[PDB]
Ligand binder design. Structure first.
Ligand code: HEM
Ligand code: HEM
Ligand code: D7P
Ligand code: D7P
Ligand code: H4B
Ligand code: H4B
Ligand code: CAC
Ligand code: CAC
Ligand code: ZN
Lengths: 404, 406
């Protein structure tokens, strides 16, 4: 009933009793495991139960469970849902639900920070124009001149029948991807599609590898509007190597603020189709995946050649060598430009403390091993040796379909 | 679309559906409520042995393209008969070979399965004494090692009989280094083998005191205390470790054996259980150069090496671990190659596994794979398997883990 979780490096053993709190099924069955898959294949009753449960969680957190306010609040919920089929959250509950959602996110290695989160309430938003206003202040606050601060801005919840508020982009800041001559792609191939949708709704494209995309904000049941972020708002870091003086020539750079904007935030049944959040990057996100993925910037061979390595054979480990320097570059740069950044070694060790804190606080922690273990040097980090249990808890961040 | 799991590769964008998982008959540890896929270890009825025996026979006759033939029907009638009167049964020579290869083919944690059809199966089912086991084991090592040009192979000992004690090899591999517990508490040698070393000593072994002492074998015959045997040094091939451009690396005196030979798994076929069936192939460089030499709970040489390279080991942001881990793997590859001993780097192996998936998609509708184990310990996303989704499920014949015989 309760899984046994073991750390094969130290021999320690814990029992995950938190999983019993899961009210939603994952992708696996006793016949086969689909844990490595990226993507998974209301009546008054539904909303009500979730809402009540969430309200019970909120009052336990403030040590006033069963109290007077707890009672009246549960009643305000029955009351609102009974006559409108739904309800609304008080600002302090919303703040509790957002932090809780981060806490419950199995694929995030930085949850040690879950408690420090600045929540911006933008549920009184009525147009894509206002959205762009809230987004500009989020970026301005989150970036904080390089000394990054975690934050999230919550826009209006979804309402039955009506169109959702949406941020078409998957990150507030993303470089354009332009399909050219042949199958070739200039810039970031992952953003090819969104780049084309931006050109379709106007926008004079650039012809660079690192052109910051415009934003396509959408208000309910209306076509999306294109807005352009003030360049002084979008902080960037030119990449250079601590010893490889020619690395800087490559003209590589990345944005300082990782701001996910494509996920759905579910709290007590309500669903916030638009709620961009941001913390700060872990160096492998940029150094290994963004720059070395074959279907991304794919700069592995370039830096290899420049390093005078033998790309003729795999056994020379030229791939591995270049990947380490490129990652070193990202770390060196950021620290030099005085912008917040965490290396995969420091991040996974803090994640280990997080597991212990959560073991004492709740009896376990939902974790997706495939995502927690970094893209390079997996076993050189402590999480590789740590067993993990994955399950879905609410509040939660979930993936949702693309607007178009 | 289809009523089977959809499987995507995110590098290429290609999709496939796994229909082979419908052949599974043993449930794993996951439930719709929680996934335990990252767990290393998830926690006979005359009627049930038939179900398995009958299934395996159909599998065998389909591989030779004779399903429904009279020979097929006769083999089934015969198997049922033999079990209905003795409570068990035996596999013909050809079925053992088929079954052995299928167990490897079905191993979810093995990245070298593209070599599955090429496996030398040595039948040693006649064996009747620990001493005899040792002759077979030495022959296997001799044949498999082949002076550096390794050849995959497996030796099969007598299956588990009713009430009768199992044949067992106590060591986890036929060739492993001793682990000596120091008074201060540190370990000299390979920490993973401390328990098997102590047991050998109690059983009569005269331990050495180096970091790399080839351990003696503890072979147990049915209903008997394990007898101990030492491997003639000429049989056990080893490779000294040097680095191509860092001359001081050789000074470290690091080395590793050439033959990887798992000896603690149970080979299961049609319900029959072969508690002792050691197999070997050849190393993927990361096994040695990353897990065995760098795991903090193994040799743990990362710092020693980083210090020699003059890296700053006081700050994780220098990526000193990554830098030393790479060079160490380059040293393993360089040394095996210079010594003319078969070895495969993680880039070559993962690429071959991607080819194996494509072959199995056509041949069986899929392939059971353990993502956490398939993706290499260093440079994960730099290899193609990191971007390949994988479905995991138990298929029989199979290699299962078995409790230690003590
Ligand atoms: C404070 C620093 C933070 C760091 C270093 C961090 C790092 C990470 C990393 C490395 C991943 C995987 C990224 C990928 O492979 O694409 C991740 C995923 C995620 N993080 Fe965090 N995170 C931080 C803050 C946040 C915040 C504040 C939230 C939300 C309030 C959060 C929510 C998530 C979620 C939902 C995922 C999975 C997203 C997906 O599936 O694409 N993280 N995080
Ligand atoms: C021909 C070269 C071979 C290569 C390169 C290869 C490579 C690998 C690797 C890298 C692992 C994981 C090692 C670890 O993390 O401990 C593995 C596991 C495994 N291999 Fe292979 N393999 C080969 C041959 C064989 C053979 C001949 C068999 C058996 C007939 C086989 C059966 C298995 C099994 C059952 C496992 C799982 C062991 C465990 O769970 O601890 N492999 N293989
Ligand atoms: N450091 C982070 N990291 C989170 C990065 C999330 C990252 N996710 C991704 O890039 C996912 N691969 C998008 C995806 C999901 C499912 C199917 C297809 C594609 C992104 N949005 O940029 N966040 N902070 O600090 O808030
Ligand atoms: N290249 C290989 N690799 C297989 C290596 C298997 C390797 N396995 C291991 O070292 C597992 N960690 C043993 C274990 C499993 C579960 C719980 C505790 C301990 C070993 N035996 O040496 N083999 N060939 O070629 O057959
Ligand atoms: C197929 C596989 O699930 C996929 O490539 C996953 C693996 N682990 C990951 N881990 C992180 N952090 N981010 C990712 O995008 C992925 N991709
Ligand atoms: C806890 C986790 O399951 C464990 O460390 C696994 C991860 N992946 C692995 N992969 C391989 N090839 N071998 C291993 O021993 C492991 N150990
Ligand atoms: C140094 As550049 C090519
Ligand atoms: C070079 As060595 C210490
Ligand atoms: Zn699972």
């Amino acid at each position: 009933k309760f899984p046994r979780v073991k750390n094969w490096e130290l021999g320690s053993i814990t029992y995950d009793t938190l999983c019993a709190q899961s009210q939603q099924d994952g992708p696996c069955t006793p016949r086969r495991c689909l844990g490595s898959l990226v993507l998974p294949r209301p009546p008054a009753e539904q909303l009500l139960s979730q809402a009540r449960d969430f309200i019970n969680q909120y009052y336990s957190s403030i040590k006033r469970s069963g109290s007077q306010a707890h009672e009246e609040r549960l009643q305000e919920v029955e009351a609102e849902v009974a006559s409108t089929g739904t309800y609304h959250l008080r600002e302090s509950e919303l703040v509790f639900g957002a932090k809780q959602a981060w806490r419950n996110a199995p694929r995030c290695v930085g949850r040690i920070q879950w408690g420090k989160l600045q929540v911006f309430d933008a549920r009184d938003c009525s147009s894509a124009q206002e959205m762009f206003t809230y987004i500009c202040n989020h970026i301005k606050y989150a970036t904080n001149r390089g000394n990054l601060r975690s934050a999230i801005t919550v826009f209006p919840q979804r309402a039955p029948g009506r169109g959702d508020f949406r941020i078409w982009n998957s990150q507030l800041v993303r470089y354009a991807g332009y399909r050219q001559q042949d199958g070739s792609v200039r810039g970031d191939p992952a953003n090819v599609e969104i780049t084309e949708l931006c050109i379709q709704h106007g926008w004079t494209p650039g012809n660079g590898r690192f052109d910051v995309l415009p934003l396509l904000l959408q208000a309910p049941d209306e076509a999306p509007e294109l807005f352009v972020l003030p360049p002084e708002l979008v902080l960037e870091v030119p990449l250079e190597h601590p010893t490889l003086e020619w690395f800087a020539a490559l003209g590589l750079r990345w944005y300082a603020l990782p701001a996910v904007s494509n996920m759905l935030l579910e709290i007590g049944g309500l669903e916030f189709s638009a709620a961009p959040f941001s913390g700060w990057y872990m160096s492998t996100e940029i150094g290994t995946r963004n720059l070395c993925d074959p279907h991304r910037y794919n700069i592995l061979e370039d830096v290899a050649v420049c390093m005078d390595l033998d790309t003729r054979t795999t056994s020379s480990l030229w791939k591995d060598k270049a990947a380490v320097e490129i990652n070193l570059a990202v770390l060196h740069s950021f620290q030099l430009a005085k912008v917040t950044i965490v290396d995969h070694h420091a991040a996974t060790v803090s994640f280990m403390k997080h597991l212990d804190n959560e073991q004492k606080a709740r009896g376990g922690c939902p974790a997706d091993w495939a995502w927690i273990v970094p893209p390079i040097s997996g076993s050189l980090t402590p999480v590789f040796h740590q067993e993990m249990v994955n399950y879905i808890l609410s509040p939660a961040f979930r993936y949702q379909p693309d607007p178009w």
